[PDB]
Ligand binder design. Sequence first.
Ligand SMILES: Cc1cc2nc3c(=O)[nH]c(=O)nc-3n(C[C@H](O)[C@H](O)[C@@H](O)COP(=O)(O)OP(=O)(O)OC[C@H]3O[C@@H](n4cnc5c(N)ncnc54)[C@H](O)[C@@H]3O)c2cc1C
Length: 121
Amino acid sequence: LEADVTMTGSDLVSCCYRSLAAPDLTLRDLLDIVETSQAHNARAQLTGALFYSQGVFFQWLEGHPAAVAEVMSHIQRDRRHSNVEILAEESIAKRRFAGWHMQLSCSEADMRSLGLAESRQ
Ligand SMILES: Cc1cc2nc3c(=O)[nH]c(=O)nc-3n(C[C@H](O)[C@H](O)[C@@H](O)COP(=O)(O)OP(=O)(O)OC[C@H]3O[C@@H](n4cnc5c(N)ncnc54)[C@H](O)[C@@H]3O)c2cc1C
């Protein structure tokens, strides 16, 4: 029996933001966002996930404070995601995620009737 490291995370921080996905957004913009953010998060040691439904964003990031902020300063110069109201930046221990996630991928499949494919013609 070996002892686990337990909650070891002195310098993590989790910025948890609420945004309202601007109508100026394109799927291609999300699909570009997702790809570049994973890559940055992987490097910056940031873990994450994203909840996007009804055009509203709940997205948060767990990482070492300044990385998170490096990320914040890179994101907060947006116009993409309606307001991006972080409003919550809290120092965490992290462990929860090992990678950042995004719901929007190459299509969503089936749930398109709830926003994507509103009408035909
Ligand atoms: C809903 C949403 C969620 C997001 N979540 C995350 C996230 O979790 N993590 C994250 O990191 N980002 C996130 N972003 C930001 C998104 O991924 C941006 O497109 C951004 O990541 C672009 O790459 P960047 O992080 O390197 O910063 P950016 O500065 O926006 O990169 C793009 C620009 O940087 C320039 N650039 C790159 N490297 C250099 C350099 N060395 N010197 C000078 N200029 C340079 C490029 O020329 C380009 O013009 C999110 C954005 C949105 C809308």
